[PDB]
Design a protein around this ligand. Structure first.
Ligand SMILES: Nc1ncnc2c1ncn2[C@@H]1O[C@H](COP(=O)(O)OP(=O)(O)O)[C@@H](O)[C@H]1O
Ligand SMILES: Nc1ncnc2c1ncn2[C@@H]1O[C@H](COP(=O)(O)OP(=O)(O)O)[C@@H](O)[C@H]1O
Ligand SMILES: Cc1cn([C@H]2C[C@H](O)[C@@H](COP(=O)(O)OP(=O)(O)O)O2)c(=O)[nH]c1=O
Ligand SMILES: Cc1cn([C@H]2C[C@H](O)[C@@H](COP(=O)(O)OP(=O)(O)O)O2)c(=O)[nH]c1=O
Ligand SMILES: [Ca+2]
Ligand SMILES: [Ca+2]
Ligand SMILES: [Ca+2]
Ligand SMILES: [Ca+2]
Ligand SMILES: [Ca+2]
Ligand SMILES: [Ca+2]
Ligand SMILES: [Ca+2]
Ligand SMILES: [Ca+2]
Ligand SMILES: [Ca+2]
Ligand SMILES: [Ca+2]
Ligand SMILES: [Ca+2]
Ligand SMILES: [Ca+2]
Ligand SMILES: [Cl-]
Ligand SMILES: [Cl-]
Lengths: 204, 204
């Protein structure tokens, strides 16, 4: 049965090579219909919104609530127009970021009230969630070391708050598996392959 | 003391000439610092979002929740970056549409749940509201008769639902004054001038 697998983590955790290993592992397990997505983005409108979030806004203060609304608008478009239909056709979906990123960056980083984050999540997504999330955990500075956009230019305390939120969620959500991304690409890759293989072997 | 006056109504009710009469009336009453706004829009980002809402989306279904989020994102930017600062400087603000339009079009027209509309309003605006709203009431067909965008191309039942919501709000909100916009421009203009003059004469 079709599943939604998400790859998560701070800047430079290694989500790009992780997606590679996840797709390859799925293929090795006989899954031959897979759709990758990335957030924010993945549709014409969502990509326009991604640009609005990543670009600088000279002469205009981009309010925290506005940022949240934009990433959610992009997510709704992707979920309704790409992800759900793909799952419905029987394709597995592998996402480069999903809602956990809003929780970490907008909730932890921007410090938006938890009541606000949950009511917006409910409004946008209902109970829709990934089946497995592979959270690549990394010290923010180390990840940054690996033309910065508006968010990447935030001070490190923002990313520390984001990491704190990611870790809380990884610890409370049984569907989140944490990977130590501070290792060599080879070891991280090996741990991802194992965690996913281990998880696939327990479905049903 | 600085006040926020909003002009509301369906397509073609006559909001453009109404704004004219409102600003002129304020000036005649010694108010010499006034900032007009229009929604969605009024900032660089808000204008980009206005275009996204008004433009067609070939090959992509624009979800109802997405539309709501976009108009709210535009509103937050305008309220925080233009309206509130203007009021704070002592300028009166005259808006061409505001939140009542979301209630009518997204709430009534798109039929978004009331719980969703209120939680999003609270999230975006808190208790911020206009001091006076002049709602220009018109039969939708008559107003349409007076290159249509994506919303203007909706069937008339959408606008009837929007009118129904506008009227409910006009009837429940003491700060909303309803004007019969089905009259000649001269008579509508005269009624607006009177309603505003009557209202100004009762402040404090
Ligand atoms: N475990 C690792 N050790 C060292 N470098 C890495 C590791 N994982 C990724 N990188 C490098 O860091 C950079 C960003 O990786 P990327 O996968 O794009 O990160 P993300 O998508 O999480 O921002 C790339 O140049 C990549 O080669
Ligand atoms: N009371 C009225 N009677 C007849 N025509 C009107 C009236 N009010 C406005 N119009 C006309 O309808 C058109 C749209 O008016 P406008 O003020 O732009 O409407 P809105 O901004 O509410 O969409 C204009 O050509 C205007 O001249
Ligand atoms: C999905 C999502 C991403 N973001 C941020 C995380 C990233 O900084 C950015 C997405 O870009 P990113 O995934 O870093 O792409 P790249 O590796 O090419 O820079 O958007 C949010 O702030 N909120 C969200 O909901
Ligand atoms: C402010 C706002 C406007 N709208 C709609 C109402 C209008 O159809 C459109 C704004 O354009 P409109 O005010 O009609 O400008 P013009 O007279 O130049 O066409 O956006 C919403 O659907 N939701 C909102 O929250
Ligand atoms: Ca980045
Ligand atoms: Ca990446
Ligand atoms: Ca496919
Ligand atoms: Ca699911
Ligand atoms: Ca636990
Ligand atoms: Ca867990
Ligand atoms: Ca219009
Ligand atoms: Ca107008
Ligand atoms: Ca001014
Ligand atoms: Ca006020
Ligand atoms: Ca009443
Ligand atoms: Ca009233
Ligand atoms: Cl911040
Ligand atoms: Cl509709």
């Amino acid at each position: 049965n079709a599943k939604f697998i998400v790859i998560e983590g701070l800047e430079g955790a290694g989500k790009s090579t992780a997606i590679q290993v996840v797709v390859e592992t799925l293929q090795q397990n006989g899954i031959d219909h897979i759709t990758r997505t990335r957030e924010p983005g993945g549709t014409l409108l969502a990509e326009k919104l991604r640009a609005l979030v990543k670009e600088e806004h000279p002469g205009e203060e981009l309010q925290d609530i506005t940022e949240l609304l934009l990433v959610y608008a992009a997510r709704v478009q992707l979920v309704e127009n790409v992800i759900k239909p793909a799952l419905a056709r029987g394709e597995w979906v592998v996402g480069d970021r999903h809602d956990m990123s809003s929780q970490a960056y907008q909730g932890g980083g921007r410090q938006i009230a938890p009541s606000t984050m949950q009511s917006l999540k409910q409004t946008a997504l209902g109970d829709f969630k990934p089946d497995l999330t592979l959270y690549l955990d990394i010290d923010p500075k180390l990840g940054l070391e690996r033309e910065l956009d508006r968010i990447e230019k935030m001070d490190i305390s923002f990313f520390e708050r984001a990491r704190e939120r990611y870790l809380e969620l990884a610890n409370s959500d049984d569907s989140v598996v944490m990977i130590d991304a501070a290792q060599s690409i080879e070891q991280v890759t090996a741990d991802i392959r194992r965690a996913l293989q281990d998880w696939l072997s327990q479905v049903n």
